[PDB]
């Protein structure tokens, strides 16, 4: 087989934990899921590929640990709560900083639009211009919206991001 | 020199027609995303929660000021009636007859943030009583010689408390641990606000002098603002930046951010702020709210990186 490393950041609340959780297997799922401390690392494969995936915390007390996986990632998954309108910008400056970094590689970046069943819901053009997503040119990346509960577009995520780690 | 904040999100058209002291955030409901509170001159009482209104409720009068001990409280006339998470809870009154003229936040003892809390009223006689931490009763009535125009608290409740009073004379006031100084300083002007900072109380007079004063009388620094002062703040940035700042808005229309003797950063809102709030709003922390003359309400947030040095 073949492993890769998956960094998977975002503001606090945006459902990571849980996006990761629909790629874990239905038996091995936890029934509710918690506020992730400090930060947690599962397995998962999915084809010839075996994701060595990298959960951190978003509140902004442990933003300073996502610095420490930079260097070796291979792929960030990047999570976004959609009924926040209001901390879209905050989002936007962890991510040009993450970017900025002398360390992060020009590796593939998938944009979760996550929560679109939320009625208020940030629609995935308006979000992606919210990040600015259009000025990154030089890596690969796409936004998908998505629901963590259900797994909902989370396949037609990492399927994406599969790709192009293949 | 440049502005330091991240532009969150801005609504041109709220219905908000009010000042500093009727405004508020904090947790009155629990779901950890804190909600805004603000007592309007409409003698309504809208509530914020994120990037939109939530609810509006009926004042029984136009408001004073509010704060909170999950319990919401404005203050009016000689009542105060304090809600709580969110209807109707007392409608303690003054004992002797007295009418409101400001009100403020104690800490009970841990002088920790989300802690047990006493609320404090100072009233047109000349008193400033400290209640219990069910807002129970009169904890300390301490009467004093002036009329208070605004009052800060820096301490605890059971520890030790320092409390500064702006009276309308024109003269700043100290009470510590429950016992009023003979202390008196002599200001410039008549007080416009009050902040409680590090280790000193920030006076701006109408004369567009900001003033810096130690509980001994010290004046350890003067800002001399270009415009008039419409208001100011405790900007608080807790962690391994800890810096405890003063935001002062004029009428000119400049939002300015004093560190101490230094200035920070400076942006300017197209119709001048009259509120001014900073701390955790929605699920972020260092966040400032702005409500201005033409009723308009805005969200800016402080950068991680953001260095105030
Ligand atoms: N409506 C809705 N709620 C969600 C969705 N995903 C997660 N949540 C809820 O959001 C809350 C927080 O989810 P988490 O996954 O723990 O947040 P996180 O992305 O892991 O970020 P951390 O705070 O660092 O743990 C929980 O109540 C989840 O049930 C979603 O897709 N839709
Ligand atoms: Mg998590």
């Not at chain 1, 401390?37 to 397995?43: A, L, P, Q």
């Not at chain 2, 309007?40 to 609810?55: F, N, V």
């Not at chain 2, 009068?61 to 009542?79: F, N």
């Not at chain 2, 009169?138 to 125009?149: D, R, S």
Request: glycine share 6%.
């Amino acid at each position: 087989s073949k492993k890769v490393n998956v960094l998977v950041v975002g503001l606090d609340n945006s459902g990571k934990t849980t996006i990761i959780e629909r790629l874990k297997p239905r038996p091995r799922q936890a029934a509710e899921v918690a506020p992730t401390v400090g930060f947690t690392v599962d397995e998962v494969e999915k084809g010839p590929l075996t994701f060595t995936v990298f959960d951190m915390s978003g509140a902004g007390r442990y933003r300073t640990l996502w610095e420490q996986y930079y260097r070796e990632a291979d792929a960030v998954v990047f999570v976004v709560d959609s009924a926040d309108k209001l901390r879209m910008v905050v989002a936007r400056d962890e991510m040009e900083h993450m970017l900025k970094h002398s360390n992060m590689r020009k590796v593939p970046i998938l944009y979760f639009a996550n929560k679109k069943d939320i009625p208020v819901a940030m629609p995935p053009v308006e979000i992606a211009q919210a990040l600015g997503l259009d000025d990154i040119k030089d890596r690969p990346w796409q936004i998908v919206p998505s629901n963590g509960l259900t797994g909902e577009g989370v396949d037609k995520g990492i399927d994406w991001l599969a790709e192009r780690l293949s | 020199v440049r502005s330091v904040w991240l532009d969150a999100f801005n609504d041109p058209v709220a219905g908000i027609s009010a000042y500093t002291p009727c405004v508020h955030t904090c947790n009155l409901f629990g779901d950890g995303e804190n909600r805004l509170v603000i007592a309007d001159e409409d003698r309504k009482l809208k509530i914020w929660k994120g990037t939109q209104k939530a609810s509006e409720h009926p004042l029984l009068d136009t408001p004073v000021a509010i704060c909170s001990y999950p319990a919401l409280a404005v203050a009016a006339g000689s009542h105060i009636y304090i809600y709580r998470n969110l209807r109707p809870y007392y409608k303690f009154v003054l004992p002797p007859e007295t009418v409101i003229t400001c009100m403020d936040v104690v800490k009970q003892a841990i002088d920790e943030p989300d802690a047990v809390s006493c609320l404090v009223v100072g009233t047109e006689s000349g008193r400033i009583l400290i209640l219990n931490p069910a807002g129970t009763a009169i904890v300390k009535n301490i009467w004093v010689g002036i009329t208070p125009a605004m009052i800060a608290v820096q301490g605890e409740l059971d520890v030790g408390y320092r409390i500064t009073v702006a009276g309308r004379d024109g003269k700043l006031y100290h009470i510590r641990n429950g016992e009023l100084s003979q202390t008196i300083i002599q200001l410039e002007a008549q007080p416009v606000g009050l902040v409680r900072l590090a280790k000193h109380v920030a006076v701006g007079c109408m004369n567009d002098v900001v003033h810096a004063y130690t509980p001994t009388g010290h004046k350890s620094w003067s800002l001399y603002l270009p415009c008039h002062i419409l208001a100011m703040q405790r900007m608080e940035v807790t962690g391994q930046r800890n810096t405890k700042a003063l935001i002062v808005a004029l009428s000119n229309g400049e939002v300015r951010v004093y560190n101490e003797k230094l200035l920070v950063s400076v942006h300017v809102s197209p119709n001048p702020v009259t509120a001014l709030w900073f701390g955790r709003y929605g699920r972020e922390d260092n966040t400032l709210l702005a409500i201005t003359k033409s009723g308009a309400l805005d969200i800016k947030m402080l950068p991680r990186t953001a260095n105030l040095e």
